[PDB]
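dumping the sequnces here before i forget
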Amino acid sequence: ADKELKFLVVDDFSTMRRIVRNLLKELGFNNVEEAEDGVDALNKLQAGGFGFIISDWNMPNMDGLELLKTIRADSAMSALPVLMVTAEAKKENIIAAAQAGASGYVVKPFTAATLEEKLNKIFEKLGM
Amino acid sequence: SQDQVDDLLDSLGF
Ligand code: BEF
Ligand SMILES: [Mg+2]
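..and the predicted 3d for all of it:
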């Protein structure tokens, strides 16, 4: 996948966003912006050019599942890769992610190696 | 059930 792919990292906890941005940087992905919930995310996305979303599940105003469904049903953004992040792997939450079109699913905390594994899975499926 | 979670994740390509 292109090193200059533009990521949006979405989490209501600024420290978690910083950590994810830093892991991306460690992998060579320097083109990264941040959003603090699903509403903030959609605002940022209007600027265009975004190529990959990493979103937390639990956020105020619009949560990660709500954001994912919105992106997937959007006329312009429907095929954007979205990696969902959760605090705990549960059947119900995984199946919810699957039904909504999550490109990937990862439990926090995760290492740069795990992030790379999940990104590569998504890139492979999408032919990126 | 943890095995069911791992199977589920694998089946989804997650
Ligand atoms: F708030 Be996220 F689901 F960790
Ligand atoms: Mg959160």
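Chain B touches chain A through eight residues (CB under 8 Å).
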